[PDB]
């Protein structure tokens, strides 16, 4: 498998409709990491998620969306207020999600588990 692959800004909501329609079309969920450039927790979970993203190659795409670099009317569609928050998206819409304040192999774990529960 690649040694990593590494995830895709979200820049707005005109970005995000069109990756959940293609993503639909393709009968896949996304997986969006919503972070911060100073959040050291989302950092530090990066890596991870990066290697997990290589584990999905081709099978389901990783996103991240800078909570204070996108516009604020996509952060509050997310429901967004911790970070990091890793989401998964499908058939157009919010499924699940995993709050990673926590050890991150262990949230990595967690984030596997909800793609399993809607891939």
């Given at each position: 498998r690649p040694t990593s692959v590494e995830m895709e800004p979200i820049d707005d909501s005109h970005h995000l409709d069109k990756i959940l329609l293609q993503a639909?079309?393709?009968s896949q969920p996304i997986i969006i990491?919503?972070?911060?450039?100073?959040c050291g927790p989302c950092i530090y979970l990066k890596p991870k998620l990066e290697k997990l993203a290589a584990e999905y190659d081709t099978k389901i795409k990783f996103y991240c969306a800078d909570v204070n670099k996108v516009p604020q009317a996509l952060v509050k569609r997310g429901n967004i207020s911790k970070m990091p928050?890793?989401?998964l998206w499908k058939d157009g819409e919010m499924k699940a999600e995993v709050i990673g304040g926590h050890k991150a192999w262990l949230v990595i774990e967690e984030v596997r588990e909800m793609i399993q529960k809607f891939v």
């Open positions: 639909r079309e393709l990491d919503w972070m911060a450039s100073w928050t890793i989401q």
